[PDB]
Ligand binder design. Structure first.
Ligand code: 442
Length: 239
């Protein structure tokens, strides 16, 4: 914070280089093409089908990342549950968004399937599609590596704001540790875009929205499409 007054812009402590070693390994371990015909999407029940055939593995990989982080494993059992449930979609939207490519204008879902904005949207996501795309478009320019996505993810995971969490103080603290190892890692990367870090923290807000905006969306679907249509893990994590 005095280093912050002098504009010293520090790079990570050795102790911190550990944290970066782990989240990037946890992340690369679990981050994983085929264009889904313009045929599908163009509620579409066939777009519905194709995107829920593949979401159960996506969710486990997001869990497998949290398992690989040891700060996560220090938490009581009902708290672990609660975090995973919160960021599950948040983490998931980012993971897709950074795999935008503007030539085709497609994301890559689950690391295989390549969807346009209308295709993802018509399978039941509505504006939650537009949010994940608009985002991936903006992150085109930020040029994130596995380590930054990893840390962003680890910031999302450790969100003491979740309803019914018990170990708030400790989780918050863990989070500040990722944010500090993250900001120091940005400093170290020297990105050519003024206020890179402020700009990047607003992506946390937008991802937080998407997750929310997806839960609401999921209530509009529960109405018309019965619960029977939904992969049992998806249900356990979004209900
Ligand atoms: O719910 C979803 C969540 C993610 C999704 O795309 C993905 C998938 Br699949 C996986 C991931 C993680 C990854 O890319 O590895 C991100 C994203 Br974005 C597609 C749907 C989807 O089309 N389901 C529609 C049924 C439904 C569910 C919730 C709300 C509204 C409608």
């Amino acid at each position: 914070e005095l280093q912050k007054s002098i504009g010293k812009k520090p790079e990570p402590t050795d102790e911190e280089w550990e944290l970066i070693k782990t989240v990037t390994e946890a992340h690369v371990a679990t981050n994983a093409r085929k264009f889904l015909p313009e045929d599908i999407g163009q509620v579409d029940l066939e777009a519905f089908s194709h995107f829920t055939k593949i979401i159960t593995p996506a969710i486990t990989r997001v869990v497998d990342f949290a398992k690989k982080l040891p700060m996560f494993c220090e938490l009581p059992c009902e708290d672990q549950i609660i975090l995973l449930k919160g960021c599950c979609m948040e983490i998931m939207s980012l993971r897709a968004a950074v795999r935008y490519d503007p030539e085709s204008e497609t994301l890559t879902l689950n690391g295989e399937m390549a969807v346009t904005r209308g295709q993802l949207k018509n399978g039941g996501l509505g504006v939650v599609s537009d949010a994940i795309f608009d985002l991936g478009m903006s992150l085109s320019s930020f040029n994130l590596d596995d380590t930054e996505v990893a840390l962003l993810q680890a910031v999302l995971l450790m969100s003491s704001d979740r309803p019914g969490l018990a170990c708030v103080e400790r989780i918050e603290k863990y989070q500040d540790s990722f944010l500090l190892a993250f900001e120091h890692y940005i400093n170290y990367r020297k990105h050519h875009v003024t206020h890179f870090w402020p700009k990047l923290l607003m992506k946390v807000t937008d991802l937080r929205m998407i997750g929310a905006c997806h839960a609401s969306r999921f209530l509009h679907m529960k109405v018309e499409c019965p619960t029977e249509l939904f992969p049992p893990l998806f249900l356990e994590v979004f209900e």
